[PDB]
């Protein structure tokens, strides 16, 4: 079967991270939407105008609001994109056939929204040449970040070609994890996010979302299916594109 995949990037990135995978899925007959979230990619807003992960997720919510009744999509989020999936599934679960976590955080319904991100900080505490800044928005002090180039090269794009790492240096923008605000956010619900079919795709070769963190997430909240890709790096849609398109085809054939 054919599906409508909605591809969701991670913080500091944009729709451009999907420039290799999107053509491949369309060549198999699928419809593909790759969104820039707020203050990301070529979106005009700056991160200082955004005060929460929910505000950050606005292009995705607006997009899901606009789908005609009875039309369903498969959400595919990479890295922190799993938090944008949780926020959207709580509001539009009728519109989601399934969600695919691609080297992604997997929030639960039992602990606070920042839980899985707090655990990532325990497991991976040194972000090398990443720089931080603070800003205020709606009375809250928010810590923003800009991903360092050595961290980009060594941990996120480990095995990507120099021309793919060059795009990351040219296009990554300031972003935020909004961690202190996720902590105070209401929990994701069991009827919204909790009811969605979840497929967890990962590689043990990931150098930021380390096997210890990823296997801990699978044990904390069991996914409906787990696919482990051999080789690659954190950006599997760049280093294992064809393998990821095979997995998504199989997901299109099971879920609707």
Swiss-Prot record:
SUPFAM superfamilies: alpha/beta-Hydrolases. Residues 4-240 form the AB hydrolase-1 domain. Acetone binds at residues 10, 79. Changing residue 9 to A: Almost no change in catalytic activity in crude extracts, but the purified mutant protein is inactive. Inhibited by hexafluoracetone and rhodanide (thiocyanate). Also inhibited by trichloroacetaldehyde via a covalent link on Ser-79. Susceptible to several serine, histidine and cysteine inhibitors: is strongly inhibited by diisopropyl fluorophosphate, diethyl pyrocarbonate, HgCl(2) and parachloromercuribenzoate (PCMB), to a lesser extent by iodoacetamide (IAAM) and iodoacetic acid (IAA), but barely by AgNO(3) and PbNO(3). Belongs to the AB hydrolase superfamily. Hydroxynitrile lyase family. The keyword Cell inner membrane does not apply. Keywords: Lyase. It comes from Hevea brasiliensis. It catalyses: a monosubstituted aliphatic (S)-hydroxynitrile = an aldehyde + hydrogen cyanide; a disubstituted aliphatic (S)-hydroxynitrile = a ketone + hydrogen cyanide; an aromatic (S)-hydroxynitrile = an aromatic aldehyde + hydrogen cyanide; 2-hydroxy-2-methylpropanenitrile = acetone + hydrogen cyanide. This enzyme can be used as a biocatalyst for stereoselective synthesis of a wide array of (S)-cyanohydrins by addition of HCN to aldehydes or ketones. Optically active cyanohydrins are interesting intermediates for the synthesis of alpha-hydroxy acids, alpha-hydroxy ketones, or beta-ethanolamines, all of which are important building blocks in organic synthesis. GO terms for molecular function: aliphatic (S)-hydroxynitrile lyase activity; aromatic (S)-hydroxynitrile lyase activity; methyl indole-3-acetate esterase activity; methyl jasmonate esterase activity; methyl salicylate esterase activity. Optimum pH is between 5.3 and 5.7. The record marks 206 as: Increases basicity of active site His. This is (S)-hydroxynitrile lyase.
């Amino acid at each position: 079967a054919f599906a409508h995949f909605v591809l969701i990037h991670t913080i500091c990135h944009g729709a451009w991270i999907w420039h290799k995978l999107k053509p491949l899925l369309e060549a198999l007959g699928h419809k593909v939407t790759a969104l820039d979230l707020a203050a990301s990619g070529v979106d005009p807003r700056q991160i200082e105008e955004i005060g929460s992960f929910d505000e950050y997720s606005e292009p995705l919510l607006t997009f899901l609001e606009a789908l005609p009744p009875g039309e369903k999509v498969i959400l595919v989020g990479e890295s922190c994109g799993g938090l944008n999936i949780a926020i959207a599934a709580d509001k539009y679960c009728e519109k989601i056939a399934a969600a695919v976590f691609h080297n992604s955080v997997l929030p639960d319904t039992e602990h606070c929204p920042s839980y899985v991100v707090d655990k990532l900080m325990e497991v991976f505490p040194d972000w090398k040449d990443t720089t931080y800044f603070t800003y205020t928005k709606d009375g809250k002090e928010i810590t923003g970040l800009k991903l360092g180039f050595t961290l980009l090269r060594e941990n996120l794009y480990t095995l990507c070609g120099p021309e793919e790492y060059e795009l990351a240096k040219m296009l990554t923008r300031k972003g935020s994890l909004f961690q202190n605000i996720l902590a105070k956010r209401p929990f994701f619900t069991k009827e919204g996010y909790g009811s969605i079919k979840k497929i967890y795709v990962w590689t043990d070769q990931d150098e930021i979302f380390l096997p210890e963190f990823q296997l801990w997430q699978i044990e904390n909240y069991k996914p409906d299916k787990v696919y482990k890709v051999e080789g690659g790096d954190h950006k599997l849609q760049l280093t294992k594109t064809k393998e990821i398109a095979e997995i998504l085809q199989e997901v299109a054939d099971t879920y609707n």
